[PDB]
Write a protein that binds this ligand. Sequence first.
Ligand SMILES: Nc1ncnc2c1ncn2[C@@H]1O[C@H](COP(=O)(O)OP(=O)(O)O)[C@@H](O)[C@H]1O
Ligand SMILES: Nc1ncnc2c1ncn2[C@@H]1O[C@H](COP(=O)(O)OP(=O)(O)O)[C@@H](O)[C@H]1O
Ligand code: ALF
Ligand code: ALF
Ligand SMILES: [Co+2]
Ligand SMILES: [Co+2]
Ligand SMILES: [Co+2]
Ligand SMILES: [Co+2]
Ligand SMILES: [Mg+2]
Ligand SMILES: [Mg+2]
Lengths: 596, 609
Amino acid sequence: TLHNIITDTENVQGSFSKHEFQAETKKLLDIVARSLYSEKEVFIRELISNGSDALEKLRHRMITAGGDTAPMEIHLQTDSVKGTFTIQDTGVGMNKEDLVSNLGTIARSGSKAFLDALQNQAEASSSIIGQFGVGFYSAFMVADKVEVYSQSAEADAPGYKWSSDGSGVFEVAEASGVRQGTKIVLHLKDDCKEFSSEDRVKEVVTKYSNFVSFPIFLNGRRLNTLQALWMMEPKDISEWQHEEFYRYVAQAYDKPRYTLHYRADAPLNIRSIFYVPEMKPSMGSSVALYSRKILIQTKATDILPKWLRFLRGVVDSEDIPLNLSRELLQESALIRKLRDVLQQRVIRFLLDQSKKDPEKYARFFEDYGLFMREGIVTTGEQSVKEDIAKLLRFESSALPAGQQTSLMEYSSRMKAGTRNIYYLCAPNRHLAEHSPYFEAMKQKDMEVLFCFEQFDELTLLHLREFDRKKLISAETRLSSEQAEDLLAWMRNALVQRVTNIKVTPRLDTHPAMITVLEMGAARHFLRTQQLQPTLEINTGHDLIKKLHALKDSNPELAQLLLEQIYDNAMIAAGLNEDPRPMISRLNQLLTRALEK
Amino acid sequence: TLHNIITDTENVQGSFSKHEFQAETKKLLDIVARSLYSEKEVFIRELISNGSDALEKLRHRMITTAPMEIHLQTDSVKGTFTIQDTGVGMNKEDLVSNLGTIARSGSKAFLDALQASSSIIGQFGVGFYSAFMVADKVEVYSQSAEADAPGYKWSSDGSGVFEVAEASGVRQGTKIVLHLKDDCKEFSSEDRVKEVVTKYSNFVSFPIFLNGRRLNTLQALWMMEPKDISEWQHEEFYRYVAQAYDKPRYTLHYRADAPLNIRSIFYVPEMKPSMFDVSREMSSVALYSRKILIQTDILPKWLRFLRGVVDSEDIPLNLSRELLQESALIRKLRDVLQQRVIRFLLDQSKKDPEKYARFFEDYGLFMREGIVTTGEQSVKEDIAKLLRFESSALPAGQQTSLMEYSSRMKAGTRNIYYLCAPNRHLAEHSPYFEAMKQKDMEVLFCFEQFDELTLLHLREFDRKKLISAETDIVVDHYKEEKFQDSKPASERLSSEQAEDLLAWMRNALVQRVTNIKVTPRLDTHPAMITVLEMGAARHFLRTILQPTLEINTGHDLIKKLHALKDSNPELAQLLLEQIYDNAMIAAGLNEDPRPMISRLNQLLTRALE
Ligand SMILES: Nc1ncnc2c1ncn2[C@@H]1O[C@H](COP(=O)(O)OP(=O)(O)O)[C@@H](O)[C@H]1O
Ligand SMILES: Nc1ncnc2c1ncn2[C@@H]1O[C@H](COP(=O)(O)OP(=O)(O)O)[C@@H](O)[C@H]1O
Ligand code: ALF
Ligand code: ALF
Ligand SMILES: [Co+2]
Ligand SMILES: [Co+2]
Ligand SMILES: [Co+2]
Ligand SMILES: [Co+2]
Ligand SMILES: [Mg+2]
Ligand SMILES: [Mg+2]
C-alpha cells in the first residue's frame, strides 16, 4: 500500500555553469542588526565585548613594543535629553582601512584573525571575545544613526569618523582630535530611549558584562567591582570570598554548605564553582554559563543533568562552541561529554563529603535527597543510576534507630553466598518492624533496608539493580475466655474501622498497638486525608482488664475508653500525627472517668 | 570623585567618502552550517517548510488539480536524505538567485506582492543552507511551471561555488538529495526522520509521505473556529499536545486580536496532578508559528498544570527560529493569559460548582502557590477569587468564596474572619468558633493544610483585613469587649475559687506558659491556648512560645480539677498536664504527640477505679 514518487529518473543534459555564492547585502545587514538575539539590550554586551577585545589587543602589543602606559578602560555615557548612548575604549583603535574593512564588511572579524595568528599559549588567546564579525551591527537595532570615532596607535595616523544610518551605506571622513582608541555614539530610536537612562544601562552591564577584565565606567562612575572568582587558583580564595561570591551568583543571603571549585582542560577548557546552599528548598536561581567572562546563559541548559539543578554557581568555558546569538550552545559531542564529566565530578565530590563529615552530609541528604531520587528515576543509563545511588542513605534492621547506611555498606555485610538486596519501604520504624513481611526474614537472618522517605519506593523500583546485585521488596493475664469475650465485643464496636483484632504477649507498657501488612496501603492512607489495620491487645495491661470489666458496667463509657485505646495505638504507629479529631471525645472520657 | 574621559571634542576635517557594506560570503556560509541552529535535526524542519511554501505558491497559482504533497526518503545504505515536493519548482534564474544568494527569499518577495495569504513560512532566505549542517554534498533537481522551461540540476558542497546544469527527467516541483556527512548518519534512519517531522512539522497543511507511507498529520485546532471543534477533537488534540492518555476536564479555547494577536488552547487534565511531577522541572505549553513548532515563560509558574498551545503573530522570531524576541511583549502576553485563565476558571465555578469543587480539590495547591509567590497585591487578590471555603453562615458542605463573603458584610464592618480546622465538624465545634459565636460576624471555614499560610500571605482582600478567629480572641482582651459566660454564675467556680485554682496552675506549669487566665467565652471546652500570632506560630512549627492558657470555670473537668488539687494532688497534676496538652493539640501547636501517650495511659488507669 505504498505511494512514493521519488524515482531515480534525472539525467544531466548539456554542459554545466559555475557560480559563486552571493549575499543580499542590504537585507543581511537588517537580519544581522535585528534578528539574531532574544533582546535589543544586548547591543551593550556586544559593544563592551568589542572594547574589551580592543584593550586586550593593545595589552598584547605592549608585551613587545612597550609604549606609554595609558590606562585601559571602557567608559559609557548616557544623555537623557538627546537620547544618546556613547561608549569609549582606550584600546587599539582602527585606521581608515580597518574601519572600512571591519565595520563595513558583515562577518569580517579582525579579532578572529588576530586570535588565529597568536601563540596558543598567549594570554590573549583565551580572553578575546569576538568570532563572527557581526556583533557591532546590533547597534542598528536601537539606533537611527551610529557614529564611530577612531584613532589607531600608529605612524601618526589621522583620526577618522565612520557613520551610517544602517541602510546599506556608510561614510568615512578624517577627524580630530580623536583620542587613541574608539568612541561610538548611538542616536537612540524613540522606542529605545530607555538606553539613555543611567539605571537601565547599569542593569544591562551588570547582567552580561559584570566580570569583564577592564574597568567599566558609567557617567564617570565605576561599575564592575567584582572579580571573576572562577578564574582564580582554588587556594588563593578565602572562605569569605566564596561566601560573598555565592551570595552574589545565587542572589542569596545565607552561605554555601558545600563549595566545589572545578578546573580542567578536557574535553573543554573549564573554570567553575558550584555551591550547595545552607538553606533548603523551596534570576540567579541556577548555575550560569559564561565564556571568557561574558554571560552566555543565566540558566545553563546543556551542561548539567536536571537532577543537579539545586547547585548554584558558574561554569566558564573558553572554547565551548557558541551559537551565533551568544545565548545558546551548539549541539556538540564535547558539550555532552562535559555534562557526563561534571555529573561524575559532583557525585565524587558529594561522596568525599559523606566521609569527611557524615553528620553534615546527613543534613545535606535530608534536604536535597529528593534530587538524587529524581535523578535515579529519570535517567536511562543504568550505570548512571548506580552512580547517583551511592549518595542514597537509608536505615536498617541490623542497625539502631536514626543510624544511617548506604547500599555499599549493606553490600559489604552480605554473606558471599546470597547476592540480592532486600528493602522495605515504610512510613516509619514501628510500622516496618512489625511488618509480617519483614518478620519473615527476621528469623531467616537477613538484613533489610528500611526506607522511610518519600519516593524511596519507586526510586528502588526504577533502580532495579545495584552493584550487579538485585533489589527486591520484602513483600512477596485475663484467662483465655475473658479475653475472647472482650475480643468478640471490641470486634463489634470497630466493625467499620479495623479488619482484624488479635492478642499479643510482646506488649509491655502499651495496652494495644496497631500493625499493618501492606506498606503501600499505609502510604495511600497517609496521603489520603482531606487501609486495613490489625490492632493487638495486651491482656496483662490495666486499661484492657479495666476495659473488659467496663463493657458490662458502663457500655457507653467503655466505648469512650475503647476508641481512645484505638486512637492511642494509631498515634503510636504514627498513623495519626494530627489527633485534633479525638480531643473533644477524650475530654468527655476524662470527665466521666472522674466521678471522684 | 568622578572619572570620565568622554568629551565632545571631535571635529570632521575635509570631505567624506561614501561606501557600501559588503559581506564575507564564505564565512557566512560557514556560520549558517555550524553556528546558526543550536540543533542539527532542524534542517528537516527547514526543507519541509520550503516544500510547504512551494506548494502554497502553486495552490495560489491554480486559483488562476495535480496532487500537492511532500515526500521523504531515507537510504541508510547510500547515506542519503531525500525530500521532494510537487510544488511551483524553480527556473534557472530562480535557482541561481534564490539558492545562490544568502538572504534572498523568493518566498518573501511573493508575500510582498500579495496586496489569503498567511501560510507562507519563509522570510529570511537562509533556511536552505541548513542542509550543510548535515551534508557535505547537496543536489537539487527542479522543474518550473509550466512553462516551456527545461529541468535543472543544482549541486554544491556548501563552500564557495555551485553548478547548474540542464536535466530531462525532472518532475514538476523540486527534489533535494542530501549526501549525509559521517557524523550525521542518523538522518538516514526512517524512525529518526519520522521523530523530527512529528516534532516540528506535524501541522504542515500538505500530506507528507515518508518512504511511501503517509504520515498522520494533524489539523491546527488553535487556528480554527471554537464552534467547529467537537469534544472528541479536543480529546484527541489534548492527548497529542500533552502526550497523555486521559482526557481534559476543562478546555479553554482563547482567541484575541487586541492588544495582541493570540490563538491558543489550554487544557486541564482529568487526571490529578502527579505529586512527584509537581516537584520536578518539566514546557507545559507549546509555542507555534504558521503551524510550525518553536522550541520555547509564556504562563506564570502557578499555571504550569495547564497543557496546550499558544500562537502569536506578534512574537518575532530570531534567525534560527528558536528564540522569541521582545521580552516585554511576552510578559504582556503572559499577563493577558493569566487574567483570561482566571476569568475562565471563575466562569467554570458558576457553570458547575460541583465539578469546580473537584478541580479545586485536585489543583487548589497551584492557586495557593501563585498567591504566596507573587509580590503584586492585585494579582494575589485576583488568584484568590479562585479559592473556596465553607462558612458559618451556610449549610455544611456548601462552598463559598471571598467575594460572596464580602457581599454579605455590613457597611460598618472592616474585617474578614476565618478559621482553619481539618474539617467542618471541627470548625463548627472549635473552642475558637464558640468564642466567635458571641459576636455577629460570619467566619470562613478553611480545611486544607496550607489555607492558613495562603491567607497570611494574602493579608487583605477587597480592602478588608483578613483576621483569624484565634487572633481576634487575643485582641479582644485588650479591648473593653464585654462577654458573658454561656453558663450562669451558679454553675461556675466562685471568684475566690478561681484565683486559688489559677495560682496552683501557675505553680504547676511554671516552665510552659506565659499567662493562665479565666475566659467567659467557652462552653463545651475546658480550656484553650491563645497566641496573638497563631497562624504564624502554626507555620513556624515545621522543624518555645508565649502561649496563654484560658480556662472555662463552668466546665465540669475544670471544677473537678479545682477539687482534685486538694483531694488527690498528684492526680490533679497529671490531669493538669493533660488538659494543657489537649489545648495545645486543639490549637494545632503540638509537637509529635507520641510522648504524650504513656502519660495519658497512666492518667487514664489512675482515674478508672
Ligand atoms: N571598539 C573597537 N575598537 C577596535 N576595533 C573594533 C572595535 N569594535 C569592533 N572592532 C573591529 O571590528 C570587527 C567586527 O566587530 P564585531 O562586528 O563586534 O565582530 P566580532 O565578533 O569580531 O567582535 C572586530 O573583529 C574588530 O576587528
Ligand atoms: N522546494 C522548493 N521549491 C521551490 N523554491 C524553493 C524551494 N526551497 C527553496 N526555494 C526558494 O529559495 C528561497 C530561499 O530559501 P530559504 O533559504 O529556505 O529561505 P526562506 O525559506 O526563508 O525564503 C525560497 O524563498 C524559495 O523562493
Ligand atoms: F561581534 Al561578534 F562574534 F563578537 F559577531
Ligand atoms: F528558509 Al527561511 F526564513 F524560512 F530562511
Ligand atoms: Co543516473
Ligand atoms: Co595557533
Ligand atoms: Co560635534
Ligand atoms: Co452590602
Ligand atoms: Mg563583537
Ligand atoms: Mg525556508
